[PDB]
Every structure is written in structure tokens, then in C-alpha cells.
Design a binder for this molecule. Structure first.
Ligand SMILES: CCCCCCCCC(O)(P(=O)(O)O)P(=O)(O)O
Ligand SMILES: CCCCCCCCC(O)(P(=O)(O)O)P(=O)(O)O
Ligand SMILES: CCCCCCCCC(O)(P(=O)(O)O)P(=O)(O)O
Ligand SMILES: [Mg+2]
Lengths: 282, 291
């Protein structure tokens, strides 16, 4: 009787969610928490610009939470990663929750049915590309040495992965522009990712990419260079170190030395970046 | 300048993605499809809804994709060793690929919504429903995981448990119903009640089948309906030792069969949570059938 009235009230109402439940679920996210120039070309009413910014931050910060779980990373922005503090379970769920909260902010960008559809299609396509690229980068790392990607394979993976959020931001803005730079943002994403792989080793930075076993741009060059020159032992030593998932700084340095002195992959990568930067700068 | 050409063809084209690539990253998902898992429920609701078969199939693929992908994530979150009688995908392909693939399929499911219509207004409503219920699904899952992982910081009351279920289990049931109603050329209250019955019966059988199954909810430390009743019952009656012993067992995350059986028998004889739950289920069932 009393129970029934309560069940009645419950099922006839929208699901109950308090501001306090929201805070509990947002903890892994708030922890990591600690465009306008592109707008000098797009000129979006500071209104929409606010939402696009929130969308990008939600996606970007959430994808980093997941990326850190996927790479078992101990640090991010100089502090202990969220999953080590709140646990992997809550961190995955919170990150995924923020993906859908970002998705909901898209509807406040516009109610114009034609443009709305376009915005959700862009959001959908680029999150698809982001995940395809991440899945490929993860697959090569976790199945090593089953597949050693080539430079071309690596660049296609980057166009999907890194290119995704770069293209997402640019395409949303362009579509809302009251006034294509995609080829340019793509080049920019490639530069940013290769430089990120390069600096991970040069700052050595804990050179966490080695510990993670990542097929970075220099590693890909080094593996294909040693394969081509028939340097079996060197090729194998590189694979052996990546497979150790080691945190030993001496071992990480040993690999970096193979890359500096045997395959000259760091100079190779620097050069490649300079040629890309030149394509923009020229 | 030959690199320049390659680079140019690269950046001026859509990202390259092959069917071989698609197959590689689909492994964790394909594995959960190997064993049968709904198409039923959808067809029953269609007696009321009358969706043409070609659209019913698409709603069906959407719910399938989301449900299966949810289970991949759920199993990682509960560190479940088995799903549908087989080794769990994360244990085979690893947590990283599995998280990524499950999340990838959430977006492939979203992409399918546009195979339902070309009418802009209706398209917008379907996406909004999709979006709302995925938000609700994660809100309830967030709470369920939080209570379990930070126990004994929060001991939910029956009411909090029911709101968590309305969000979590209610999410897929309402998503399915709302999409169909929005397509039909409200049974929401009914579907909410069906989901609550479904979840509580699920919590109940996980223990009763062990007292044919592994009472894995105990190994997972879950604040199930019978556990919620027992924790509040022991607190209310001043059964301090049993209240703390229930907490200690959950926190063990144990696979020991005898320890799980001890906890189930505490629910059976000491707190009468199993009988309480069996009756709560019957009463909810009565609210329907008798109407
Ligand atoms: C589906 C989530 C994909 C997130 C990818 C984010 C890129 C992260 C890196 O920038 P980081 O791990 O050095 O922060 P990447 O070098 O591209 O792996
Ligand atoms: C309408 C949402 C789906 C309802 C059906 C759920 C079936 C039960 C399982 O989720 P489980 O027995 O592994 O917990 P499935 O694996 O999909 O059969
Ligand atoms: C945002 C992911 C939500 C996943 C929800 C999965 C519910 C699965 C269960 O049906 P099962 O773990 O017994 O298969 P639940 O009893 O509700 O945990
Ligand atoms: Mg990096």
C-alpha cells in the first residue's frame, strides 16, 4: 500500500539525480582540470564560442582520462593520474559520461534543424575517427611484434587519432562561422603528434612512451631502418626493450642511444618536423 | 618535395581507414557476439507501436550495439572473469583495446540513428532521446560503482538504490521504448517498472542460484538490492557485528565459495533479506498483472 504509492511516484517521474550525485560522479574529471585565434577567422558570437570551448574541453579532458588508463600512466600534468586516485572503474565511467555531456552541449549551439544535423554529424564522424586511430595505435602496441607499422601506416593512424579532435574543433567552428582550413589543421595535427613523440625522448620527461611500448614516429623509423639495413640484432634489441614495459631509466637511455647513434632516428624525426613546419611557414 | 606531395595528398583527403583495420579493432566486440545474449521485448512492444519492420530492425541494431558495448565496459569495471559463459573480452584482448572498442561502438550506434529518418525534426528528437538515456545510464552506473568502490563511505538506503536503478537499468529500457514511441505512426512508467523488476530479480537470482551460478555479485562487492536491505536492517536492529561482517566480506572481493555461501546464509537466516526481496518482487509484479 504505502510501498505502491512510492513506486508509483518513482516510475511516473523522470529519474532522480541530485547536484550531490553530480559531484560524486565528477570527481575523476575535476581532478584533471587543474580556439580564440581560430575565431579571428571564424568570428563566432562569443555566445556560441563559449559552448564550443566547453565542448572541446570536455572531450579533450575526458579522452585524456581514458588515454591514461589505456597507457597505464602514473602522471599527467605533473600529478598522479585520476585512475590511480579514484580507481579505473569510476574513471572510465566518468570520462564516458562527459563524452555524452559534451554531445548534449551541441544542441545548445543551435536549434536550426539543418545546421544542427551538420554539427552532430561532424561530432559523430570525428569521434569515430578519434577512436579508430586510438584503437590502431593501441593495437600495434599491445600486439607487438605481430605488426610493425610503416611510416605511411603511422601517418594514417595520426590523421584518424590526432586529426580527430583538431578537425572536430575546426569543423564545428567553420560550420557556425557567420563569415576550408582542414588541410591546414590536419598538417598541424601531424606536426604536433610527431613533435610530441620526439620531445618524449629528447626531454629525457620520463620517456614514458618507452615504458608504454608505443610505436612512436622515431621508433617506427628505427625499426624499419634496422630491418632495411639487415641489422637483426639492433632491430631485435629495440623490440626487446619496448616489450619490457620498463621504468628503469638506464634501459630507457640504452634505447635512446640506439636511436641517436645507430639509426639516427632523432635527427631523422627533427628533419621531418622541419620539413612539415616549412610546408606551413612556406 | 616528394614528401611534400605525399603529405599533400594525405592532408587534403579523408583519413585512410581499411576494412582490415576495422576488423582488427572490432575483435573485443566480435568476441562478445560469439555467444547468444532482447529482439523479443522489442517485438512485443511493437504490438503497441506498429513500427514498420525495416525501421524496427534498425532500432534493434542500435540497442544491440549499445547493450553489448555496455557489457564490455561493465565487465572491465567489475573485473568480471566471465560473460555469457566465456572468458571476458578484456582478459583476452586487454582492457585498453576493450575500452576503446566499446566506446567506438557507442558512436557507431549513434551514427545508426540517422538510418531511421531523413526528417530533420524527428531526427533531432531521436538523437536527444539517445543522448538523454546514455547520460542516465552513466549516471546510474557512476553511483553503483562509487558505492561499491568506496564502501563503507556511503551505505545506500532502498530509496537511493531505486533511484540508481531508474537511472542505470531504466536507461536502456527507456531508450528502446522512447525511440519506438517517437517512431510510431506513454508506456514509459510501465517500462520503468519492468526495469526495476528486472534488476532486482537479477540481484536476487545471482544469490539464490548459488545457494548454477557463482554469486559473482558478492565477489564484485555490489550494493545489490538484498545487500542494501541487509545493511540497513542490521543497522536498524543494532546487529553491529553482522552489519560489519557483511561489509568485511564485500570488501574482500573474494572468490571463496564458502565465504560467499556464509554471506548468502546471513541474508537467508539473519536478516531475512532474501525473503524480503522475493516478496518485494512479487508485489511489484502484482502492481502490473493486477491492473
Ligand atoms: C579515444 C581517446 C583518444 C585520446 C588520444 C589523446 C592523445 C594523447 C597523446 O597526445 P598523450 O598520451 O601523450 O597525452 P598521444 O601521444 O597521441 O598518445
Ligand atoms: C532491453 C535491454 C536488454 C535486456 C536483456 C539483458 C539480457 C541479460 C544479459 O545482459 P546477462 O544475462 O549477461 O546479464 P545478456 O548477456 O545480453 O543476455
Ligand atoms: C554505462 C555502462 C552501464 C552498464 C550497465 C550493465 C548492467 C549489467 C547487469 O545487468 P550485469 O552486470 O549483471 O550483466 P547489472 O546487474 O545492472 O550490474
Ligand atoms: Mg604522447
Amino acid at each position: 500500500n504505502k510501498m505502491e504509492a512510492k513506486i508509483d511516484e518513482l516510475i511516473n517521474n523522470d529519474p532522480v539525480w541530485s547536484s550531490q550525485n553530480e559531484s560524486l560522479i565528477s570527481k575523476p574529471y575535476n581532478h584533471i582540470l587543474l580556439i580564440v585565434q581560430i575565431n579571428r577567422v571564424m568570428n563566432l558570437p562569443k555566445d556560441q564560442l563559449a559552448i564550443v570551448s566547453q565542448i572541446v574541453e570536455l572531450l579533450h579532458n575526458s579522452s585524456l582520462l581514458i588515454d591514461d588508463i589505456e597507457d597505464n600512466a602514473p602522471l599527467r600534468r605533473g600529478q598522479t593520474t585520476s585512475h590511480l586516485i579514484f580507481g579505473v572503474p569510476s574513471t572510465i565511467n566518468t570520462a564516458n559520461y562527459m563524452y555524452f555531456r559534451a554531445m548534449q552541449l551541441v544542441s545548445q549551439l543551435t536549434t536550426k534543424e539543418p545546421l544542427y544535423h551538420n554539427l552532430i554529424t561532424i561530432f559523430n564522424e570525428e569521434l569515430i575517427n578519434l577512436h579508430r586511430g586510438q584503437g590502431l595505435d593501441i593495437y600495434w602496441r599491445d600486439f607487438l611484434p605481430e605488426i610493425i607499422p610503416t611510416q605511411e601506416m603511422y601517418l594514417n593512424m595520426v590523421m584518424n587519432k590526432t586529426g580527430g579532435l583538431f578537425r572536430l574543433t575546426l569543423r564545428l567552428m567553420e560550420a557556425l562561422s557567420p563569415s576550408s582550413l582542414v588541410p591546414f589543421i590536419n598538417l598541424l595535427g601531424i606536426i604536433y603528434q610527431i613533435r610530441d613523440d620526439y620531445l618524449n625522448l629528447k626531454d629525457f620527461g620520463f620517456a614514458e612512451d618507452i615504458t608504454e611500448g608505443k610505436l612512436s614516429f622515431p621508433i617506427v623509423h628505427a625499426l624499419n631502418f634496422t630491418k632495411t639495413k639487415g641489422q637483426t640484432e639492433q632491430h631485435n634489441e629495440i623490440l626487446r626493450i619496448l616489450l619490457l614495459r620498463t621504468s628503469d631509466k638506464d634501459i630507457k637511455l640504452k634505447l635512446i642511444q640506439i636511436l641517436e647513434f645507430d639509426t639516427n632516428s632523432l635527427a631523422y624525426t627533427k628533419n621531418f618536423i622541419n620539413q612539415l613546419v616549412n610546408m606551413i611557414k612556406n
